[PDB]
């Protein structure tokens, strides 16, 4: 039957969820499963083995965090099943899995097997009435109130650029590169090892994520700023320690614009955006340059878009008006857009029937993938 549908954004690091017709995701919690790595002696301790949810951040000094989704592709399927059940848990949604149409998102160009296996989970473990899997870009266009644009996002693990012109998506112009937030944080962790801090545990890694979200900032000209010393921010650990970052506060998010630093022949995020535009036709290049829509949490770096303008302006043709729109709700654009598309009747004319899935299987979702 069709009750109020549920939108779930499988952000490779932060999963965002809520019902359709809403206006904000009230269920935002990081994506992992934390199991304890210590010994239990005192009866009356914490509860349960796995610790998905806010309890993880509340007791991170005990857990051994494991990420289920690496680069948008799920590795530990059992963890994603536990996370999805936690989304339907009594602390997050309280509904039953056999009650709502599910609007699952997905990073573009993910392997076929990922969609297939997600279908198996949602129609065998959960017995959902309906399911639809879509691109993350289209949703951001819904949440940004537009129809034409190039959604250049940066989730926690996959950055990509999808150029959509007047609601028509151009698949051959999609550029995907697997270097996002986790790689920025991982590279920053390596820099702190060279600064003498040796963060190597799992909880230490999420402390690095907190640093990346708070102390880093992007460059404008990394040589102008490389020849001069900087602020050297003093971040305080929860323990009470004191860490200094130095020039790595701007060298850490340089990995996005240049994967040569991490030792990887790939393209910058600017090259992804510019190529994604240029892989398309010629009559549309000017309009796509005039409508660049960001989303994704790894575009929230301070001083990011200004460097993006200097970069694309350095690459795009002469005097073309490059116009980047970056809203405040970039972190939830895919969720808000999922709510917008799921709050329609075309959505009823757009999902995949449970019966039809049982009759067909993988071929059903690969036909209705767009």
């Amino acid at each position: 039957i069709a009750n109020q549908p549920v939108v779930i954004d499988n952000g490779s690091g932060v999963i965002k969820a809520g019902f359709a017709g809403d206006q904000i995701p009230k269920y935002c919690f990081p994506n992992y499963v934390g199991r304890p790595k210590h010994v239990r002696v005192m009866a009356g301790a914490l509860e349960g083995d796995i610790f998905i949810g806010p309890k993880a951040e509340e007791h991170r000094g005990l857990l051994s965090i494991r990420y289920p989704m690496e680069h948008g592709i799920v590795k530990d399927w059992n963890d994603m099943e536990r996370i999805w059940q936690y989304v339907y848990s009594k602390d997050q949604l309280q509904t039953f899995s056999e009650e709502h149409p599910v609007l699952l998102t997905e990073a573009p160009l993910n392997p076929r097997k990922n969609r297939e296996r997600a279908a198996e989970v949602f129609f065998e473990t959960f017995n959902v009435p309906a399911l639809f899997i879509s691109m993350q870009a289209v949703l951001s266009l819904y949440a940004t109130g537009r129809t034409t644009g190039v959604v250049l996002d940066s989730g926690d693990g996959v950055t990509h650029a999808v150029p959509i012109y007047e609601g028509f998506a151009m698949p051959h112009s999609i550029m995907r590169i697997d270097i996002a937030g986790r790689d920025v944080s991982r590279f920053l962790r390596l820099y702190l090892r060279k600064e003498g801090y040796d963060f190597h545990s799992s909880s230490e890694f999420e402390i690095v994520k907190a640093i990346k979200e708070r102390a880093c900032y992007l460059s404008i000209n990394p040589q102008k700023d490389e020849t001069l010393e900087t602020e050297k921010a003093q971040y305080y650990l929860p323990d009470g320690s004191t860490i200094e970052i130095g020039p790595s506060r701007f060298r850490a998010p340089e990995l996005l614009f240049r994967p040569d630093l991490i030792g990887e022949e790939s393209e910058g995020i600017h090259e992804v955006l510019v190529f994604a535009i240029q892989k398309s036709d010629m009559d549309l290049r000017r309009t796509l340059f005039s409508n660049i829509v960001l989303s994704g949490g790894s575009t929230l770096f301070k001083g990011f878009g200004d460097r993006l303008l200097s970069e694309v302006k350095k690459l795009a043709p002469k005097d073309v008006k490059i116009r980047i729109s970056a809203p405040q709700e970039r972190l939830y654009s895919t969720w808000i857009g999922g709510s917008i598309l799921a709050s329609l009747d075309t959505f009823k004319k757009m999902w995949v029937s449970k019966k039809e899935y049982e009759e067909d299987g993988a071929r059903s979702i690969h036909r209705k993938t767009f």
């Binding site: 935002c28 005097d319 008006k321 116009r323 980047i324 405040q328």
Partner: peptide, 24 residues
């Protein structure tokens, strides 16, 4: 706005439109 406060991370005090100047 409260709707963009209640959430954990939001670009507070940042220009929303990045665009090249005039003088084409």
């Amino acid at each position: 706005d409260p709707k963009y406060a209640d959430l954990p991370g939001i670009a507070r005090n940042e220009p929303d439109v990045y665009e090249t100047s005039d003088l084409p």
